[PDB]
Amino acid sequence: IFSQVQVRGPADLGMTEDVNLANRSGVGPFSTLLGWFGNAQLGPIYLGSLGVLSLFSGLMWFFTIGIWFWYQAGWNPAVFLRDLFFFSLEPPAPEYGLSFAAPLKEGGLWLIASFFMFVAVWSWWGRTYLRAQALGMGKHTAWAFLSAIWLWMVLGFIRPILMGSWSEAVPYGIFSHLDWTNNFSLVHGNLFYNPFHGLSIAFLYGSALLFAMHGATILAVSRFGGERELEQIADRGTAAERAALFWRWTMGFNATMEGIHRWAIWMAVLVTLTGGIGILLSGTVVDNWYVWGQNH
Amino acid sequence: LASLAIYSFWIFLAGLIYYLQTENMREGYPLENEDGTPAANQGPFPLPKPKTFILPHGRGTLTVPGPESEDRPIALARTAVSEGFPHAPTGDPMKDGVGPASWVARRDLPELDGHGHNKIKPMKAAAGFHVSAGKNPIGLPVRGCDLEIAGKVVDIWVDIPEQMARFLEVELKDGSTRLLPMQMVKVQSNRVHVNALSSDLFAGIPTIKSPTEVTLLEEDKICGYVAGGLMYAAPKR
Amino acid sequence: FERKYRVPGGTLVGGNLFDFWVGPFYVGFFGVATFFFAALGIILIAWSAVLQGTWNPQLISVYPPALEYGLGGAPLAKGGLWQIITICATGAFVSWALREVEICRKLGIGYHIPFAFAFAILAYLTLVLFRPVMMGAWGYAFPYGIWTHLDWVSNTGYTYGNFHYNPAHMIAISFFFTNALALALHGALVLSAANPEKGKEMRTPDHEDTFFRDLVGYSIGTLGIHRLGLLLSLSAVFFSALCMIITGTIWFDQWVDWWQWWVKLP
Numbered sequence: 001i002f003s004q005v006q007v008r009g010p011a012d013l014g015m016t017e018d019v020n021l022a023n024r025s026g027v028g029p030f031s032t033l034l035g036w037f038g039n040a041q042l043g044p045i046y047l048g049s050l051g052v053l054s055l056f057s058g059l060m061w062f063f064t065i066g067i068w069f070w071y072q073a074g075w076n077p078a079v080f081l082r083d084l085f086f087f088s089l090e091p092p093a094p095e096y097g098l099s100f101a102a103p104l105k106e107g108g109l110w111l112i113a114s115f116f117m118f119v120a121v122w123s124w125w126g127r128t129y130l131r132a133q134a135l136g137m138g139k140h141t142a143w144a145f146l147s148a149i150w151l152w153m154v155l156g157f158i159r160p161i162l163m164g165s166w167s168e169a170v171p172y173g174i175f176s177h178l179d180w181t182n183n184f185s186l187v188h189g190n191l192f193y194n195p196f197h198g199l200s201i202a203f204l205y206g207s208a209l210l211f212a213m214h215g216a217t218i219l220a221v222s223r224f225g226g227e228r229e230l231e232q233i234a235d236r237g238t239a240a241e242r243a244a245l246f247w248r249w250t251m252g253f254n255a256t257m258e259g260i261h262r263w264a265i266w267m268a269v270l271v272t273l274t275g276g277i278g279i280l281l282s283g284t285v286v287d288n289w290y291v292w293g294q295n296h
Numbered sequence: 297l298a299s300l301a302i303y304s305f306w307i308f309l310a311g312l313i314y315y316l317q318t319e320n321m322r323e324g325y326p327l328e329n330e331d332g333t334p335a336a337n338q339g340p341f342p343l344p345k346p347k348t349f350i351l352p353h354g355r356g357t358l359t360v361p362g363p364e365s366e367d368r369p370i371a372l373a374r375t376a377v378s379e380g381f382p383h384a385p386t387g388d389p390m391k392d393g394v395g396p397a398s399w400v401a402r403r404d405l406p407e408l409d410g411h412g413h414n415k416i417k418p419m420k421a422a423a424g425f426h427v428s429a430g431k432n433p434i435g436l437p438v439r440g441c442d443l444e445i446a447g448k449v450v451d452i453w454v455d456i457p458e459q460m461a462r463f464l465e466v467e468l469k470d471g472s473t474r475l476l477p478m479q480m481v482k483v484q485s486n487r488v489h490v491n492a493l494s495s496d497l498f499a500g501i502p503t504i505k506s507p508t509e510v511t512l513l514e515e516d517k518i519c520g521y522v523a524g525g526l527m528y529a530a531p532k533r
Numbered sequence: 534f535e536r537k538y539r540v541p542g543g544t545l546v547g548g549n550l551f552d553f554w555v556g557p558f559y560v561g562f563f564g565v566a567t568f569f570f571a572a573l574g575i576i577l578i579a580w581s582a583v584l585q586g587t588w589n590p591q592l593i594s595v596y597p598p599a600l601e602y603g604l605g606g607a608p609l610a611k612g613g614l615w616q617i618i619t620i621c622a623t624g625a626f627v628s629w630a631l632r633e634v635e636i637c638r639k640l641g642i643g644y645h646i647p648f649a650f651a652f653a654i655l656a657y658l659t660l661v662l663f664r665p666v667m668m669g670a671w672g673y674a675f676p677y678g679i680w681t682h683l684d685w686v687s688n689t690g691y692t693y694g695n696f697h698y699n700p701a702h703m704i705a706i707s708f709f710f711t712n713a714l715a716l717a718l719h720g721a722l723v724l725s726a727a728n729p730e731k732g733k734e735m736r737t738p739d740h741e742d743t744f745f746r747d748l749v750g751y752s753i754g755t756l757g758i759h760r761l762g763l764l765l766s767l768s769a770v771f772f773s774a775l776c777m778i779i780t781g782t783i784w785f786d787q788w789v790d791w792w793q794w795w796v797k798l799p
């Protein structure tokens with residue numbers, strides 16, 4: 001369901017709590033499109049030291065891969081563009097070790113691009129905790145981001161450390177990351193027999209289950225001001241009373257307005273939390289999950 | 297390792313499904329359901345620990361294992377034999393606010409935005425607020441669940457911080473005004489209508505105490521009553 | 534609360550005859566219908582269990598008509614029992630959905646869950662009815678058993694090489710991921726709000742919207758992120774459904790050979 005009529009007023013701001021840095025692009029409004037769905041107001045953003053650290057490093061990572069990509073097509077963009085999907089940047093991969101001193105093309109190139117990848121993401125995590133505590137909210141999104149960081153850390157840093165080879169990490173490239181993934185199945189005896197990958201599919205599926213339900217239930221109970229959620233948490237009315245009964249009378253139970261968000265975060269976090277353990281064992285302890293399996 | 301890890305994972309999942317989670321779902325629910333036996337089938341942890349929300353703006357506290365009950369009364373007689381059956385409406389249920397027209401006695405106070413005071417204010421009062429896309433509902437004749445035009449949109453009551461049309465103030469032919477919830481009206485290029493409430497009994501919408509300020513209780517009464525037009529307005533099959 | 538809500542419901546089918554709660558469960562004509570199709574399929578599977586000689590879940594698996602049977606026939610032991618359990622699948626799902634429609638009509642709540650469920654059923658019905666009939670044989674469908682269906686997946690995937698290259702499937706994967714990120718984030722925000730810093734008062738919606746503006750330069754609507762949820766999840770599942778109905782009917786080769794379309798001229 002989208003907006004019927006759209007209503008604007010003056011640029012909204014709220015707190016930000018720390019140093020007013022939160023001003024970059026105090027304007028934006030995108031009535032045209034965004035307001036039909038979500039909020040028309042774009043901006044402001046809080047760019048602070050960490051913000052800058054991440055964007056600098058994120059662009060540096062991206063551009064490192066960028067210039068390394070260009071080399072593979074020489075210089076010709078007509079070419080570069082068709083082969084954009086097939087280009088890659090493999091670790092060392094050149095297979096041998098975590099031996100650091102390795103050429104730009106055979107090691108160096110990936111290590112320096114991965115040095116930035118590391119810092120963009122890690123500073124950002126830091127940022128999400130700061131902006132949390134500033135407004136007096138604290139950790140929750142940053143709690144959940146660390147599992148995404150877990151799976152990311154597993155596949156690029158931690159597992160290659162354990163298998164003494166940076167060659168174990170996912171290579172930068174669009175189709176390469178699809179093929180490393182396929183081969184990973186293969187050399188470990190089909191990842192369907194890995195009980196954690198089956199559990200991660202249970203949670204990935206589970207998350208599109210839960211949001212398709214959570215979402216649809218507020219959009220059915222918006223009628224009673226349902227979407228306001230926190231007020232219903234601090235004062236229940238018909239919206240949280242009625243949503244409860246829908247699910248109780250359907251499947252036998254239901255969940256408190258604050259509590260279904262405790263269901264929601266947990267179902268999403270256990271997609272990368274589970275998965276990360278899953279790949280941490282694959283290859284370092286279990287090389288064939290089928291066999292492991294057949295011992296059951 | 298591995299089998300040890302998944303075994304212990306299953307342990308933790310058990311320890312995260314009931315405990316902590318179904319536990320936290322009990323917090324503000326029926327904290328144990330009576331009108332029968334108070335649990336009757338298996339046991340939860342008999343409600344979780346108390347927890348208390350500190351409210352801002354005014355102030356307040358809410359000790360969330362909520363030991364409340366209703367005697368605000370439920371005009372709902374019984375069909376008797378199955379201990380667990382329909383509860384008969386004894387009196388015009390839309391008026392009675394029972395079933396699909398139930399309200400809840402949330403505080404009789406307006407919800408204050410982040411700074412303070414009044415999230416929903418009418419657009420008359422809205423600090424430089426007016427329509428950015430789509431047809432303006434104002435002055436459009438509100439119709440019925442029939443041909444019959446029930447009144448005129450005289451204003452939009454706007455949720456200021458989220459910037460959104462919450463309600464439509466409708467000066468009913470009477471000179472009296474009341475609030476149709478946006479999510480219950482289809483704004484059209486020439487009519488505009490809550491083809492969800494008769495026309496016949498628009499009048500019965502719970503009236504506003506202060507014509508510029510909606511209160512949670514008031515709000516909840518209007519939304520609830522409006523909803524009951526679906527089903528109870530005997531057109532609406 | 535609840536008692537107030539147990540009003541003589543808006544029942545689609547079954548009039549006053551089936552308007553009643555066993556325990557929590559609303560029943561309704563489609564409730565008995567969901568039960569009738571469930572039982573017909575549980576008994577029926579137990580019959581294909583005893584008939585293959587095992588009562589163990591990693592082992593029991595019900596399989597389609599073999600690729601010669603076209604679109605009909607099969608003896609129970611050689612495909613037929615899948616078919617009739619599929620009948621009870623489609624019948625029990627559709628009955629549960631319509632049981633939701635009646636629980637909505639009673640409740641003054643409006644239709645969005647049924648509709649969202651209809652998308653889950655479609656992903657299912659694509660694999661079990663549409664792509665099969667489309668390809669001319671029930672054997673392209675999937676075995677109803679805890680482990681044999683994953684392995685069905687590995688075969689159809691690897692029949693076209695690395696199935697990662699199926700374009701609608703890439704999109705499908707992309708939405709599933711965004712939807713999961715979105716669920717974590719949405720749940721996490723209302724909780725950093727409803728339980729603030731240790732020893733502080735509750736945060737307003739305004740604090741949430743401010744955090745997302747400070748963190749990423751925008752904050753979608755509060756009713757907005759709940760519309761966004763229904764969109765990401767139901768689209769993820771839609772694109773998943775399209776990539777399969779496409780596969781056996783218009784792309785018979787190894788999926789990686791699609792992308793050469795872009796590679797040429799040079």
Ligand code: BCL
Nearest residue numbers: 148151152181182184185191197200201204275276278279
């Ligand atoms: C053919 C290959 C194999 C296979 C190989 C693998 C491998 C290998 C892995 C998985 C993993 C997963 N597989 Mg598998 N998988 C197979 C078949 C399946 C099937 C199926 C057929 O039905 C399904 C449903 C799945 C489903 C899944 C997921 C449950 C899981 C991915 C978790 C996730 O979503 O996190 C996605 C989240 C992330 C990747 C983390 C994001 C991190 C943050 C920090 C990103 C920051 C970005 C920033 C710097 C900007 C980027 C800019 C870019 C331009 C965008 N697989 C087949 C059998 N699968 C993963 C897993 O963990 O195993 C359980 C995994 O590693």
Ligand code: BCL
Nearest residue numbers: 653654656657686687689690691696697705706773774777
């Ligand atoms: C090894 C094989 C191939 C491959 C082969 C396939 C094949 C083949 C298929 C997919 C499909 C999917 N693959 Mg793949 N895929 C591969 C690798 C991946 C990777 C990866 C990590 O790289 C990912 C992320 C994915 C991701 C995906 C999903 C996008 C998609 C699952 C659709 C779905 O969830 O609908 C699931 C929805 C349903 C099945 C509906 C079921 C639900 C309804 C409501 C009925 C259930 C009711 C229940 C029985 C009642 C029980 C009641 C009890 C009380 C519990 N694939 C590899 C390369 N993939 C599937 C697809 O596209 O979907 C059609 C599919 O068929």
Ligand SMILES: CC[C@H]1c2cc3[nH]c4c(c3C)C(=O)[C@H](C(=O)OC)c4c3nc(cc4[nH]c(cc(n2)[C@@H]1C)c(C(C)=O)c4C)[C@@H](C)[C@@H]3CCC(=O)OC/C=C(\C)CCC[C@@H](C)CCC[C@H](C)CCCC(C)C
Nearest residue numbers: 205208209212571574621622625629649650652653767770
């Ligand atoms: C875009 C839609 C997403 C979604 C939404 C969704 N699911 C829903 C709803 C919604 C909105 C409900 O209202 C409904 C519900 O009741 O919620 C708990 C439901 C539901 N989604 C469920 C599951 C489910 N949804 C799935 C997917 C999705 N659901 C999508 C991601 C999947 C996946 C990921 O595959 C599963 C496993 C159920 C838990 C639940 C209710 C389904 C239902 O109607 O069940 C009642 C039916 C019976 C008990 C009778 C079944 C008896 C027999 C016919 C046996 C069938 C056997 C089977 C065919 C083979 C088994 C083989 C497998 C083991 C391989």
Ligand SMILES: CC[C@H]1c2cc3[nH]c4c(c3C)C(=O)[C@H](C(=O)OC)c4c3nc(cc4[nH]c(cc(n2)[C@@H]1C)c(C(C)=O)c4C)[C@@H](C)[C@@H]3CCC(=O)OC/C=C(\C)CCC[C@H](C)CCC[C@H](C)CCCC(C)C
Nearest residue numbers: 054055058062120121124144145148268269710713714717
């Ligand atoms: C439960 C795990 C799920 C999850 C959770 C999750 N992700 C999170 C969080 C959480 C809880 C955050 O708090 C954090 C966030 O900030 O939220 C938006 C985040 C985040 N998850 C992200 C991505 C992401 N998460 C993914 C998956 C998942 N995240 C899981 C589904 C995926 C996958 C692989 O699908 C991706 C790609 C980031 C958007 C965001 C923050 C990560 C980060 O620190 O990024 C720093 C990056 C830079 C400094 C790079 C700058 C820009 C790039 C160089 C170029 C962009 C190129 C693009 C092609 C152009 C688009 C241009 C414009 C239109 C903007």
Ligand SMILES: [Fe+3]
Nearest residue numbers: 229261723759
């Ligand atoms: Fe929510």
